[PDB]
Short mmCIF file of C-alpha atoms and ligand atoms in Angstrom, two decimals:
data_model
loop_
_atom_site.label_atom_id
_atom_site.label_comp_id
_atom_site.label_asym_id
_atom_site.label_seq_id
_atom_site.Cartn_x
_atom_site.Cartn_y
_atom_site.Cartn_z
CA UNK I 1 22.18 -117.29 13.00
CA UNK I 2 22.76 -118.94 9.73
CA UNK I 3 20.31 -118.17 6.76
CA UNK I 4 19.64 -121.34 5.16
CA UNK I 5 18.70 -124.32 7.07
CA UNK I 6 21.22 -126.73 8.18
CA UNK I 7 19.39 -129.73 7.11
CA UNK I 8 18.68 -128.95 3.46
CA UNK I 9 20.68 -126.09 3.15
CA UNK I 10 17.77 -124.05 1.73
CA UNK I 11 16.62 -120.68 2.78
CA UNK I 12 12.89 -120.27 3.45
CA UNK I 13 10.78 -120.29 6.89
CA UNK I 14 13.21 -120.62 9.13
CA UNK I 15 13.39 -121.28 13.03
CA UNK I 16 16.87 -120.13 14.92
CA UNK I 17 18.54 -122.00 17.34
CA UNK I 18 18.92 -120.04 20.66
CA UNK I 19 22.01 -121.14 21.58
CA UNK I 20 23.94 -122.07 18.19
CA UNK I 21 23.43 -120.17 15.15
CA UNK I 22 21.90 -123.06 13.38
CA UNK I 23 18.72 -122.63 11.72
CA UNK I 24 15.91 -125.14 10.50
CA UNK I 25 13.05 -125.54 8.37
CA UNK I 26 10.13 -126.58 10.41
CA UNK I 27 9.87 -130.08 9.26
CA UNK I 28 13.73 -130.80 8.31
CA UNK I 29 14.47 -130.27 12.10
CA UNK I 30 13.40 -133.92 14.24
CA UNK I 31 11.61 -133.62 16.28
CA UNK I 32 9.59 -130.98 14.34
CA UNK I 33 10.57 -127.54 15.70
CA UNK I 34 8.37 -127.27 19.19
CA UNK I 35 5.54 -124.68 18.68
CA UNK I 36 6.51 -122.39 21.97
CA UNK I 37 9.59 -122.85 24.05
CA UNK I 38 11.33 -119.27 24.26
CA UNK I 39 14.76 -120.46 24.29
CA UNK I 40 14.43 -123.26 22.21
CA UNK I 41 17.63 -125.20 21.70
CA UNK I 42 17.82 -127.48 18.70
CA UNK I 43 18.67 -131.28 18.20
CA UNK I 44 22.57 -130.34 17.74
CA UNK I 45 22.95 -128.24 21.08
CA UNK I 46 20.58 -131.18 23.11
CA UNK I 47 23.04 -133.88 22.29
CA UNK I 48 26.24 -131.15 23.35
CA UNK I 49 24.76 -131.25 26.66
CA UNK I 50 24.15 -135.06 26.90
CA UNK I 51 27.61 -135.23 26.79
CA UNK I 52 28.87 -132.43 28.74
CA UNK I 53 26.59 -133.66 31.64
CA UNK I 54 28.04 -137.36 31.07
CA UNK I 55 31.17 -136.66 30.01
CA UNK I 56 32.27 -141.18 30.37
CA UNK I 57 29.30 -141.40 27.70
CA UNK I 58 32.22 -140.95 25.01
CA UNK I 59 34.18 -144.08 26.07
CA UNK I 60 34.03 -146.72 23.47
CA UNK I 61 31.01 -149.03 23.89
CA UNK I 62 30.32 -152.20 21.92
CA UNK I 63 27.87 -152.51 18.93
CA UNK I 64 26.14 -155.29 20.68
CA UNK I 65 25.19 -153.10 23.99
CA UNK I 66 24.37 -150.18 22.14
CA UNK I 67 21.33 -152.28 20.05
CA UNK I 68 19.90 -153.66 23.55
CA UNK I 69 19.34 -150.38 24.61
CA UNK I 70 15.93 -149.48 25.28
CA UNK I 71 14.46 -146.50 23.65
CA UNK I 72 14.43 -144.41 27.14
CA UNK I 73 14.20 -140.17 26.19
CA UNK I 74 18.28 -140.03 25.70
CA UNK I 75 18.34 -143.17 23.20
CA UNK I 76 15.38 -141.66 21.49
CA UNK I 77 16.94 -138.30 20.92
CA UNK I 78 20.43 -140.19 20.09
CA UNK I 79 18.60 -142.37 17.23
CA UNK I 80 16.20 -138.56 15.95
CA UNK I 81 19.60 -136.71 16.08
CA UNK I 82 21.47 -139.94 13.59
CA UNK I 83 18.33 -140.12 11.20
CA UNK I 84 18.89 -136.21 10.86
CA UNK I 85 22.62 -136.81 10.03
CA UNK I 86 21.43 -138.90 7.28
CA UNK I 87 18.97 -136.21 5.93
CA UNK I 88 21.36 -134.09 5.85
CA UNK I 89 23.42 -135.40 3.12
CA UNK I 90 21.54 -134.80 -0.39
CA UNK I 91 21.85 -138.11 -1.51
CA UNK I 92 19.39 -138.63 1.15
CA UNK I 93 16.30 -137.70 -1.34
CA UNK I 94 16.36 -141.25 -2.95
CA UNK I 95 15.32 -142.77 0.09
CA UNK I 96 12.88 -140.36 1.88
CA UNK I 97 10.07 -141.65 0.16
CA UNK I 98 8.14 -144.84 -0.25
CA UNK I 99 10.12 -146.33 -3.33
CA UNK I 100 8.43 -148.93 -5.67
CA UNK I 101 10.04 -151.68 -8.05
CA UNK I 102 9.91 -152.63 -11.75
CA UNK I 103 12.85 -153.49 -12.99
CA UNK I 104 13.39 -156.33 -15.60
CA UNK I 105 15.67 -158.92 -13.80
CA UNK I 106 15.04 -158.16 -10.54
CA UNK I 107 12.12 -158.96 -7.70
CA UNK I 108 11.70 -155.82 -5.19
CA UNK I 109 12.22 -156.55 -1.66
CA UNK I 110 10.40 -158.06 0.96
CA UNK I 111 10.34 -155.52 3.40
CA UNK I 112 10.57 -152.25 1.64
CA UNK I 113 11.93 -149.55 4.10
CA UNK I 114 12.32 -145.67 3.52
CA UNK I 115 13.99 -142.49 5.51
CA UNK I 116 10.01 -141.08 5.86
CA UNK I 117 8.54 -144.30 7.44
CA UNK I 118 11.29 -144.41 10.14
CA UNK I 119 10.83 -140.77 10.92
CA UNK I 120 6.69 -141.69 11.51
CA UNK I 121 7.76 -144.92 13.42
CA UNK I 122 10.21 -142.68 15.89
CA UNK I 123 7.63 -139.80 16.02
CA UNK I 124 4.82 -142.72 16.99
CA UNK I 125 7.43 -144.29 19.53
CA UNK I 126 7.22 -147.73 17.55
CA UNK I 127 10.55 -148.79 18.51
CA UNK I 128 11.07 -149.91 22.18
CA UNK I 129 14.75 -150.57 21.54
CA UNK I 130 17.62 -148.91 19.46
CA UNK I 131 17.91 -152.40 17.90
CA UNK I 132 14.78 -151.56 15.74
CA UNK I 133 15.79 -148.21 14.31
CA UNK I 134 18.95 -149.49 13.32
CA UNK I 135 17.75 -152.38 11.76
CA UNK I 136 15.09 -150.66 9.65
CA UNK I 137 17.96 -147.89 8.72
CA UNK I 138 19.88 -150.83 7.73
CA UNK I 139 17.29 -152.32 5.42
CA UNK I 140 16.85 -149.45 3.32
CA UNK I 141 20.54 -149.58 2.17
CA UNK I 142 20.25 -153.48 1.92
CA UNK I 143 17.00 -153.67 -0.06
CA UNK I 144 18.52 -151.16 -2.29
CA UNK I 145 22.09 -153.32 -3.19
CA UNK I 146 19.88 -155.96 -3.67
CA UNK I 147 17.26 -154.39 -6.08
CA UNK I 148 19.74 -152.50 -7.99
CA UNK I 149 21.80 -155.76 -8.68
CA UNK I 150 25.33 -154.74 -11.12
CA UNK I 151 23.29 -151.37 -12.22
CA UNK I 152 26.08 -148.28 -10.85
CA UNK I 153 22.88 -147.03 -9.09
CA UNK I 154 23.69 -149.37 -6.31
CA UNK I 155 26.17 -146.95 -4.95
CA UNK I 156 24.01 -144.53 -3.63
CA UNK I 157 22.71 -147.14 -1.35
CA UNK I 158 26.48 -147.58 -0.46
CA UNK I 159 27.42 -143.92 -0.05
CA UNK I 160 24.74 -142.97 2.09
CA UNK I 161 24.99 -146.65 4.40
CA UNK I 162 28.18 -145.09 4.87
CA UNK I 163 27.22 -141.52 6.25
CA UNK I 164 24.99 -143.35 8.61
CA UNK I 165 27.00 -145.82 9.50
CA UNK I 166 29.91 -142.90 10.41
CA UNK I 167 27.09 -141.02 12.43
CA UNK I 168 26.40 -144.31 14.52
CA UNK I 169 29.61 -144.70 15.83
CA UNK I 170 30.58 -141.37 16.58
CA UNK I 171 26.63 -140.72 18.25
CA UNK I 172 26.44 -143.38 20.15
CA UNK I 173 30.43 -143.73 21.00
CA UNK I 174 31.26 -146.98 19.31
CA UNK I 175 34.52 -148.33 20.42
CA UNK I 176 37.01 -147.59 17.89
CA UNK I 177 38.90 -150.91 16.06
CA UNK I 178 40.88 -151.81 12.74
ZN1 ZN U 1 15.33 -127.63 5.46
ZN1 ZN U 2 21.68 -125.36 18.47
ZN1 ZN U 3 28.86 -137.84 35.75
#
């Protein structure tokens, strides 16, 4: 198995994958790595054999369908496994936490929105569709462009929209256009 975790790529307290050589801090994997369970098989190998037991799940499927899905045990794991994706880029650490806003010339949003609170909200089952997931992962990117105005800061929210926007389409097996 690997020595650092695959999430952070930090070495530490680490639990191994039984049947990839993955490893994963306790915490950094989602779900949080199951307390017993001898094999355990993490988030990466579960969604493998989603597909390998449904092997028409990977035709194309339209945007629109995937959102009215509701949030039965394989959507669930589908949305944990995408929010991972999007931990998993560093750039990810400016919004994990609850942000807050003072800067002159601009109003902070609305509805603020961060990585942490959707992890608590998927962990609490708050979404009964993937519609709501999506639209709160959404919103963090959004509220971000919005806040950060002409400032070159704005690009973060851009650059990591774009890893999870990448994720969505190959996770949940958008139809591929121009
Ligand atoms: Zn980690
Ligand atoms: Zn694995
Ligand atoms: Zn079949």
């Amino acid at each position: 198995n690997s020595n650092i975790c695959e999430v952070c790529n930090k070495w530490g307290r680490l639990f191994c994958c039984d049947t990839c050589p993955r490893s994963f801090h306790e915490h950094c994997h989602i779900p949080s790595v199951e307390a017993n369970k001898n094999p355990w098989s993490c988030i990466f190998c579960r969604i493998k054999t989603i597909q390998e037991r449904c092997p028409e799940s990977q035709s194309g499927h339209q945007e629109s369908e995937v959102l009215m899905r509701q949030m039965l045990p394989e959507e669930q794991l589908k949305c944990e496994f995408l929010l991972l994706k999007v931990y998993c880029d560093s750039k990810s650490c400016f919004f994990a936490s609850e942000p807050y806003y003072n800067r002159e010339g601009s109003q902070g949003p609305q509805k603020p929105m961060w990585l942490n609170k959707v992890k608590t909200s998927l962990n609490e089952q708050m979404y009964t569709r993937v519609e709501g997931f999506v639209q709160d992962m959404r919103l963090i990117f959004h509220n971000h462009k919005e806040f950060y105005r002409e400032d070159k800061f704005t690009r973060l929210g851009i650059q990591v929209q774009d890893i999870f926007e990448k994720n969505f389409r190959n996770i949940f097996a958008i139809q591929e256009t121009s």
